[PDB]
Write a protein that binds this DNA or RNA. Structure first.
Ligand code: MG
Ligand code: MG
Ligand code: MG
Ligand code: MG
Ligand code: MG
Ligand code: MG
Ligand code: MG
Ligand code: MG
Ligand code: MG
Ligand code: MG
Ligand code: MG
Ligand code: MG
Ligand code: MG
Ligand code: MG
Ligand code: MG
Ligand code: MG
Ligand code: MG
Ligand code: MG
Ligand code: MG
Ligand code: MG
Ligand code: MG
Ligand code: MG
Ligand code: MG
Ligand code: MG
Ligand code: MG
Ligand code: MG
Ligand code: MG
Ligand code: MG
Ligand code: MG
Ligand code: MG
Ligand code: MG
Ligand code: MG
Ligand code: MG
Ligand code: MG
Ligand code: MG
Ligand code: MG
Ligand code: MG
Ligand code: MG
Ligand code: MG
Ligand code: MG
Ligand code: MG
Ligand code: MG
Ligand code: MG
Ligand code: MG
Ligand code: MG
Ligand code: MG
Ligand code: MG
Ligand code: MG
Ligand code: MG
Ligand code: MG
Ligand code: MG
Ligand code: MG
Ligand code: MG
Ligand code: MG
Ligand code: MG
Ligand code: MG
Ligand code: MG
Lengths: 136, 98, 188, 76, 181, 44, 30
RNA sequence: AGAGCGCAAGGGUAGAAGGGGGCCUGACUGCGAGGCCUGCAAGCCGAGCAGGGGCGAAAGCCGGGCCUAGUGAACCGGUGGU
RNA sequence: UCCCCCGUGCCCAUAGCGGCGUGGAACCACCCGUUCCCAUUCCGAACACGGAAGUGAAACGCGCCAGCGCCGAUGGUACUGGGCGGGCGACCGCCUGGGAGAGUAGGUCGGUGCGGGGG
């Protein structure tokens, strides 16, 4: 990344902007609950995805961690946490679309996404595609 | 450009918009905060002969007669994007000389 | 397609949905009217119908209006339609996203590649009479690393691209298995 | 660390409001820059402080490009 | 001194020729020469203020006018310059002294140039103007060899009502400009 | 450097601030005393 | 003043510039 | 207007507060209607009046710097004056 | 009263950017000239003065077009004064009053005072 050191905690209000619509690929993965998604959680999912289907199509990761995760070294109260221990996270609210696959079968996707679910903290759902866009 | 114009606007009343042409020289006593001209002594497009400078002096005296009649006297001049030196000079020059 | 619409007036927008009716509104350069279709009906209708083909709405006034969904408000928090726009057409030309059937076996998938596909539909100025079920896309000569743009589209008669004459349409990206996992894990 | 620092509050902003009777000289509005412009019977000082020049009522006048002005309409 | 060769050359020669090659409708549309400008990149005379006067006075003669100065503003740490101090020479000339200079140009300066070949036809700003570079300044008439302490270079430009370089190319060629075809 | 201006042919001072090495050795700026009005003020 | 360009090759043009005695060479005549 | 506005950041600003010349030293004295702020003390803005003066043809501007930091009650003592 | 101009104040991009067309009788500009008042760190480009003739090319004035810019409903949300309910909790839901942003329809090459010259 690049920007600057430490950030507020902030609360996770309504699932508003946290949520979208399958914007790429055929199938997708959507969050049901709010949470901070770690960098290791994303990588854990992505790798479990591709590793499932070797030489797979294309995997889109629409969420992205930019929030520095603060944390203290097991002492007390001097100043702000050094942080960064868990690295960073992504403000994922219910309805959001983390991953979506493309150029692959329905079984491969239905399994791969199912797998990349357990790798995540949140209880999730898999959406197909429909036609819900914005046109005429 | 019109810095000067803005300066006088906030000054008070009875602005003297001296717009001069390459051959003409009009002059209006516009009172702001309402936008209305009073004494509008034109030049070439009025009656006067043909001699910019000397014409300017007289048109100034023209305002004077029409002005002192309406009970005006605030010499709120308007340089109007023009260097005070020549044509415009005579305007207020004669206008204030009487 | 057909769809049984109704006039709305004072019915509570929220309390309405609980019943089973989807709020919506029809309008054009001269029209504007509170309406409300049925969820289940609109669903199966709009499933195929979507926003490429036209749908005439049968109001109790016997009026058959040639409308199409100019916009839909999808409800966040588990997808589902909240509200529906209905643009009524006439005879003057009107812009709209027309489908696109990419047809062919590109060189990309041959050398093991990926079916990339940007605009799965394209907005284009067109007369209301012209209702192209779709547009042929000659994707086949497309190899890995290559792409297809708007300036290269096959336009049917009486139609123009109401977009940028350079926009992309599709592409061919690589896989991403072992070669990247082993390499990326160390090179980072 | 090395942070706990801050200059005390300056308590600026709109001091008087539209429709308020004012003496001669009451600071109408203290401000950082030119968030408000002068106007009819309204002067300003080194800090851009806006203040009445006459007695009357405050009024605000938005003018897009020109900006926001504030004046006092005299009366007695 | 309103009278010279190039003066009438534009009038009784180039004026009607332009009406031929493209044809106009008004005399104020015909591409008119009206602004010549000179320039010198003097990052050199930054140290010596003396060398600055020399370049300007040699310039005053060749330009047949009064020279001027123009310092930098957002300057080169890399080359010993910083803010408002150094120098750059410039002198704009128009009207009569403009034509007199163009005369010394294609009748004295251009000829005795080091292996002159012509003026690069690409040196058009795309619009109706032209910029050219020159090394030795002694190629000018009044300049004596036993006087130039340094072969200070400089580049000149020229503005015209031309809106296309085709109009410019035709206009300048008719003016007697030896274009390297 | 703290500076103090004196009056000519009189005994009056004034608040000032000169510069040490910076181009400024003397101070010949005019000023206004209480006795009479306006007379040149030297540094001193 | 009429600057007479005395270019050494067979050309003497009466232009206008400082000092009529303008000693040049290799002008437009050659 | 993303520059510049001596320096942090910010608000402001080319219809100048920015860049450049000409004349000049209002980086004046004697005051101060009325206010902002405020526990106290302190800090802040200020029209206008009298004196004498500067720049401008003039209406007019000038009681230091675009503004918000650049500082220290009282005591004791130093130097110059009525 | 009606129409074209010239000066100027109000509304503050629905006034603008760009494209095409048009006006020189009047008005304005460009323009002729650089002796006088005056001027450019260099130039009569700009300020300035005296003025034939030529032009409406540039500039400005007036029209038309919407491609950029700008303006922009309605419906439905998000959010939320006040009230309250469920669950163990991270949070979710209803009643009452208020209600955006974005997006769709759509609009837009300006309204307008006062004085003056001209038929
Ligand atoms: Mg950093
Ligand atoms: Mg830090
Ligand atoms: Mg943080
Ligand atoms: Mg979603
Ligand atoms: Mg402890
Ligand atoms: Mg799980
Ligand atoms: Mg008005
Ligand atoms: Mg079809
Ligand atoms: Mg290739
Ligand atoms: Mg390629
Ligand atoms: Mg291609
Ligand atoms: Mg604190
Ligand atoms: Mg504070
Ligand atoms: Mg003051
Ligand atoms: Mg100040
Ligand atoms: Mg520079
Ligand atoms: Mg010889
Ligand atoms: Mg700025
Ligand atoms: Mg100042
Ligand atoms: Mg500058
Ligand atoms: Mg300066
Ligand atoms: Mg100065
Ligand atoms: Mg007080
Ligand atoms: Mg107090
Ligand atoms: Mg202070
Ligand atoms: Mg006296
Ligand atoms: Mg001051
Ligand atoms: Mg300061
Ligand atoms: Mg200053
Ligand atoms: Mg402040
Ligand atoms: Mg003590
Ligand atoms: Mg008419
Ligand atoms: Mg015509
Ligand atoms: Mg001529
Ligand atoms: Mg001269
Ligand atoms: Mg002379
Ligand atoms: Mg200059
Ligand atoms: Mg001239
Ligand atoms: Mg034309
Ligand atoms: Mg035009
Ligand atoms: Mg448009
Ligand atoms: Mg907009
Ligand atoms: Mg607005
Ligand atoms: Mg809107
Ligand atoms: Mg609404
Ligand atoms: Mg209340
Ligand atoms: Mg509450
Ligand atoms: Mg309500
Ligand atoms: Mg609103
Ligand atoms: Mg809206
Ligand atoms: Mg928008
Ligand atoms: Mg209109
Ligand atoms: Mg209108
Ligand atoms: Mg008007
Ligand atoms: Mg009217
Ligand atoms: Mg008639
Ligand atoms: Mg007639």
């Amino acid at each position: 990344r690049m920007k600057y050191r430490k950030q507020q905690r902030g609360r996770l209000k309504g699932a508003t902007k946290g949520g979208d619509y399958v914007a790429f690929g055929d199938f997708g993965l959507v969050a049901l609950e709010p949470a901070w998604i770690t960098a290791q959680q994303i990588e854990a999912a992505r790798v479990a995805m591709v590793r499932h289907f070797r030489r797979g199509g294309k995997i889109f990761i629409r969420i992205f961690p930019d929030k520095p995760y603060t944390k203290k070294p097991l002492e007390v109260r001097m100043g702000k946490g050094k942080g960064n221990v868990e690295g960073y996270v992504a403000v994922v609210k219910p309805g959001r679309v983390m991953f979506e696959v493309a150029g692959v079968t329905e079984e491969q996707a239905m399994e791969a996404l199912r797998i990349a679910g357990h790798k995540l903290p949140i209880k999730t759902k898999i959406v197909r595609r429909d036609a819900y866009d914005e046109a005429q | 450009k019109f810095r000067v114009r803005n300066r006088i606007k906030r000054t008070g009343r009875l602005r003297l918009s001296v717009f001069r042409s390459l051959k003409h020289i009009y002059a209006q006593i516009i009172d702001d905060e309402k936008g209305v001209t009073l004494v509008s002594a034109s030049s070439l497009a009025l009656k006067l002969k043909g001699n910019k400078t000397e014409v300017a002096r007289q048109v100034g005296r023209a305002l004077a007669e029409k002005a002192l009649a309406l009970g005006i006297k605030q010499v709120a001049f308007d340089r109007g994007p023009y260097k005070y030196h020549g044509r415009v000079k005579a305007l207020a020059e004669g206008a204030r000389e009487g | 397609y057909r769809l049984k619409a109704y006039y709305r007036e004072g019915e509570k927008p929220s309390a309405l949905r609980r019943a089973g009716k989807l709020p919506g509104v029809m309008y054009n350069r001269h029209l504007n009217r509170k309406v409300y279709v049925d969820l289940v009906e609109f669903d199966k209708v709009f499933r195929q119908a979507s926003i490429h083909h036209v749908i005439v709405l049968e109001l109790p006034d016997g009026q058959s209006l040639p409308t199409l969904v100019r916009q839909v408000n999808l409800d966040k928090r588990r997808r589902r339609p909240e509200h529906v726009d209905f643009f009524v057409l006439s005879d003057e030309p009107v812009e709209m996203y027309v489908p696109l059937r990419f047809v062919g076996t590109p060189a990309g998938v041959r050398a093991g590649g990926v079916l990339q596909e940007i605009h799965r539909d394209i907005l284009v100025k067109v007369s209301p009479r012209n209702i192209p079920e779709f547009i042929e896309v000659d994707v086949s000569g497309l190899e890995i690393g290559d792409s297809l743009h708007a300036s290269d589209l096959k336009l049917p008669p009486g139609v123009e691209l109401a977009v940028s004459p350079e926009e992309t349409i599709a592409a061919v990206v690589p896989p991403e298995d072992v070669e990247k996992l082993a390499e990326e894990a160390a090179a980072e | 660390t090395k942070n706990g620092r801050d200059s005390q509050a300056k308590r600026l902003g709109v001091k008087r409001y539209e429709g308020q009777v004012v003496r001669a000289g009451n600071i109408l509005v203290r401000q950082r820059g030119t968030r408000f412009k002068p106007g009819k019977n309204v002067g300003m000082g080194r800090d851009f402080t806006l203040f009445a020049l006459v007695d009357g009522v405050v009024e605000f006048q938005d003018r897009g490009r020109l900006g926001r002005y504030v004046h006092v309409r005299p009366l007695a | 001194p309103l009278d010279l060769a190039l003066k009438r050359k534009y009038y009784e020669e180039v004026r009607p020729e332009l009406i031929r090659r493209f044809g106009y409708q008004n005399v104020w549309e015909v591409p008119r020469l009206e602004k010549v400008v000179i320039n010198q990149g003097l990052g050199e005379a930054k140290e010596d203020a003396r060398i600055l006067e020399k370049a300007a006075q040699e310039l005053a003669l060749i330009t047949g006018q009064k020279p001027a100065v123009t310092r930098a503003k957002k300057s080169i740490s890399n080359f010993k310059l910083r803010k408002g101090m150094p120098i750059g020479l410039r002198v704009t000339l128009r009207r009569d002294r403009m034509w007199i200079f163009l005369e010394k140009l294609l009748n004295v300066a251009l000829p005795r140039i080091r292996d002159f070949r012509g003026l690069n036809p690409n040196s058009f700003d795309g619009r109706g103007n032209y910029n050219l570079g020159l090394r030795e300044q002694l190629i000018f008439p009044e300049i004596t060899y036993d006087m130039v302490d340094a072969l200070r270079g400089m580049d000149i430009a020229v503005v015209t009502t031309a809106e296309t370089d085709e109009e410019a190319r035709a206009l300048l060629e008719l003016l007697g400009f030896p274009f390297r075809k | 450097l703290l500076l103090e201006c004196t009056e000519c042919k009189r005994r009056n001072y004034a608040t000032e601030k000169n510069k040490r090495n910076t181009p400024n050795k003397l101070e010949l700026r005019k000023y206004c005393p209480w006795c009479r009005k306006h007379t040149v003020h030297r540094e001193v | 003043v009429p600057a007479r360009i005395i270019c050494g090759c067979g050309n003497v043009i009466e232009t206008y510039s400082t000092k009529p005695e303008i000693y040049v060479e290799v002008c437009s005549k050659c």
